[PDB]
């Protein structure tokens, strides 16, 4: 949907 990210573990 809107913005940019990650990853997590």
């Amino acid at each position, epitope marked *: *949907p*809107h*913005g*940019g*990210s*990650w*990853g*997590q573990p």
Partner: antibody
Framework: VKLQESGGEVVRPGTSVKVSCKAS????????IEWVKQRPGQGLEWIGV????????NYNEKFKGKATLTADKSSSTAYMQLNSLTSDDSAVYFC???????????????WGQGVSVTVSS | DIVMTQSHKFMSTSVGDRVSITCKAS?????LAWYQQKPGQSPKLLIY???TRHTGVPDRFTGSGSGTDFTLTISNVQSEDLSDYFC????????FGGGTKLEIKR
């Protein structure tokens, strides 16, 4: 751990098609499911994304008329339905997992085998 | 509508050689991914967030860059590495590169 898509279709123009991604080996509701289109020799085109848990959806503007995305959490399955099919619609369509499910865009970590769709008379 | 271009568009290499694949963007990010597609196969993610290897990807694959220029570098190329590579940006809604195909010299 996989995504399994439904078999290839041949369909007629002006009809509708629905393709399935079935998810196994992970938590279906925690990860976004994205859909992508690949015509031969052409660039990948993003169609849109769904949050399986909600499941809220985000669409490429181009595809807003064409594509409807839905999720059925009980079966771990995601669906794409495509309407008013025309020739430009013929392609292979991939479903892919991307980020932890939240409304942000991600890189796409795992891909289904992909579903060839042919639109012809 | 961010646009992704890979300009040099076939590349040649020898097994055991090193090759670099360039990727350009029409606007900034750190959100870039690299992918590998064998013909008749689905893409496999290699690198995300510009420099981070996806699980299972071998070490001879590295990615670098930020902003508008990005590179995917493969060293000690194996026969199995001959194939299609493209980038994707997730800074805004995803758009992908045209791709670069890798070829062996002979």
């Amino acid at each position: 751990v996989k995504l399994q898509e439904s078999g290839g279709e041949v369909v007629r123009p002006g009809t509708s098609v629905k393709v399935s991604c079935k998810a196994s080996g992970y938590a279906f509701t925690n990860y976004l499911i994205e859909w992508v289109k690949q015509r031969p020799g052409q660039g990948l085109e993003w169609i849109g994304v769904i949050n399986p848990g909600s499941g809220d959806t985000n669409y490429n503007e181009k595809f807003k008329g064409k594509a409807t995305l839905t999720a059925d959490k009980s079966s771990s399955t995601a669906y794409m339905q495509l309407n008013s099919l025309t020739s430009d619609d013929s392609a292979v369509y991939f479903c892919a997992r991307s980020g932890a499910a939240a409304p942000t865009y991600y890189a796409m970590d795992y891909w289904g085998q992909g579903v060839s769709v042919t639109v012809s008379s | 509508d961010i646009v992704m271009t890979q300009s040099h568009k076939f590349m040649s290499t020898s097994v055991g050689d090193r090759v670099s694949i360039t990727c350009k963007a029409s606007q900034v990010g750190t959100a870039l991914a690299w992918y590998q597609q064998k013909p008749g196969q689905s893409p496999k993610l290699l690198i995300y967030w510009a420099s981070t290897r996806h699980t299972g990807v071998p070490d001879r694959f590295t990615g670098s860059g930020s902003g508008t220029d990005f590179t995917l570098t493969i060293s000690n190329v194996q026969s199995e590495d001959l194939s299609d590579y493209f980038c994707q940006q997730y800074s805004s809604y995803p758009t992908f590169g045209g791709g670069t195909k890798l070829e062996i010299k002979r």
